[PDB]
Amino acid sequence: NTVSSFQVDCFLWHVRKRFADQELGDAPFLDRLRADQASLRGRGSTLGLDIETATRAGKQIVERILEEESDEALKMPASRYLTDMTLEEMSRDWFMLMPKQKVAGSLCIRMDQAIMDKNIILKANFSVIFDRLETLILLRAFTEEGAIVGEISPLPSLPGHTDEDVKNAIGVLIGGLEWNDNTVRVSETLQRF
Amino acid sequence: DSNTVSSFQVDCFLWHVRKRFADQELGDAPFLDRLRADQASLRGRGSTLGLDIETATRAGKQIVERILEEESDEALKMPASRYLTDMTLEEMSRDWFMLMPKQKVAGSLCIRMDQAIMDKNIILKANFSVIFDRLETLILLRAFTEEGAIVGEISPLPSLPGHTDEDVKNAIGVLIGGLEWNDNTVRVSETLQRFAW
């Protein structure tokens, strides 16, 4: 497909662009770049296509090719690690005055019934794969003041958890926190996955 | 000088990507004519400079990996960081204890091992992230006996400046040392041999 090719081309041009802006890039390289820029512009018009749009489309094609890569020398795993929490934040000391604990989906859910009227955000350190959650390592609930008042942790002593298991556990946690007019928010990385 | 070998490598790797695209049977004739012609042209440029293509492709891969990471404009950014796990979650999670503690801070890394361990075969497993074919951020490394018992650890320190892949190789050496002085025989994981060393 002429269209598929063109998208890939606009995207690769874009990368050779950023490269030339990193101000590496020798003479004939900046020559080809200029020539390809003219070429693409006209191919754009002939195809009645929008370059910014077409660049975006080829980005998704190129992406899939790299994640598809079976070559050993170049292969990437790929699972990836997202950290919402600093190291200090994960291992930190916390206690509950009026503790509530609940195993669900191979996940241990905890919260302090005593806490009231706080604004709380849910931060999780966890791995993603294929644009969804793979393994949850830890998720903790923090008041505006950074105090920890809740935590969902994996139980490894028994089978693995889904991202379904996790999203459920969260919802169960928010709903417990809200009883005491706590307003509970969720990180933007927890929002996807 | 180097900007020309810099320019050469991206060209090599970008050709490769074009190749994988063409392999999917997606390109039209001009694209393929273009693929063909640039392969020949790339063959010339590596005879003259004096460069290996497979290696330069590899070289340009992280140059592009870089660019895709620093990409402003979210709709185009591609994260270059990846996550390797040698340990299970029960392993990563397990509490363990040293009969005879011996531990050491090394700049944002705690190095721990059990002095009571002698004449054993030990493997070092680690969960960590890696980037641009270099280790990026270690999460946990544990040292296991044949029977699965934890007898050592390297673990990141929380309140401190970031550690580096160098910080981590060094720390590994200090540990294998500690362990071999106790006459244990120490093997490192494949991920570790490839990345951390």
Q: Which domains are present in chain B?
A: 1-72 (1.10.287.10), 73-197 (3.30.420.330)
Measured CA to CA in angstroms, residue A146 lies from A141, A152, B32, B63, B91 at distances of 9, 17, 57, 39, 30
Lookup: tokens for A90: 């994960």
CA angle A34, A38, A41 (to 5 degrees): 135
Contacts of B76 in chain A (CB under 8 A): 11, 14, 55-56, 59
CA distances from B28 to A38, B34, B78 (A): 19, 10, 26
What is the resolution in angstroms?
2.7
Instruction: Quote the minimal CA–CA distance from A116 to chain B in Å.
Output: 29
CA distance A131 to A174: 24
Q: In this structure, what token pair is assigned to residue A43?
A: 């191919």
B120: which residues sit within 8 A by CB, 6+ positions away?
B145, B146, B151, B184, B185
Q: Which residues of B touch A135 (CB under 8 A)?
A: 89
CB pair distance less than 8 Å for B82 and A86 = no
In this structure, what token pair is assigned to residue A179?
Answer: 């009883």
Q: What is the dihedral of CA A79, A85, A89, A90, to 10 degrees?
A: -30
Judged by DSSP in three states, B12 sits in: helix
Query: Which of B26, B64, B137 is nearest residue A4 as measured by Cβ atoms?
Result: B26
Q: H-helix or E-strand containing A176?
A: helix A163-177
Contact A81 B31 (CB under 8 A): no
Number of Cβ within a 10 Å radius of residue A173:
25
Q: Measuring CA to CA, which residue among B176, B195, B196 is closest to residue B186?
A: B176
Task: HSE, CB side, 13 Å, CA atoms: give it for residue A142.
Answer: 19
Q: Report the half-sphere exposure of A15 (CA within 13 A, side-chain side).
A: 31
Instruction: Specify the residue for token string 């550690």.
Output: B163
Look up tokens 């050592």; give the residue: B152
Q: What is the DSSP letter of A85?
A: S
Q: How far is CA A7 from CA A40, A52, B23, B71, B113, in A?
A: 10, 10, 16, 18, 54
Alpha helices in chain B (DSSP H): 2-23, 29-49, 53-70, 89-93, 165-180, 190-194
**Which segments of B50-164 does DSSP mark as H helices, in order?**
53-70, 89-93
Residues of B in contact with A63 (CB under 8 A): 78
Chains A, B: CB contacts within 8 A come to 116
A91 close to B (CB below 8 A): yes
**CB neighbours (10 Å) of residue A29?**
20
Cβ contact B155:B112 at 8 Å: yes
Per-window interface: B 123-142 vs A, CB < 8 A: 129, 137, 139
Q: How far apart are CA B127 and CA B119, in angstroms?
A: 26
Whether the bond into B75 is cis, omega within 30 of 0: no
b (16+ CB within 10 A) / e for A126-158: bbbeeeebbbbbbbbbbbeeeebbbbbbbbbee
On whether any CB of chain A is under 8 Å from the CB of B4, the answer is yes
Q: How was this structure determined?
A: X-ray
**Taking CA atoms, what residue in A is nearest to B79?**
A80
Residue A99 CA to residue A96 CA, distance in Å, equals 5
CA–CA dist B59, A127 (Å, integer): 28
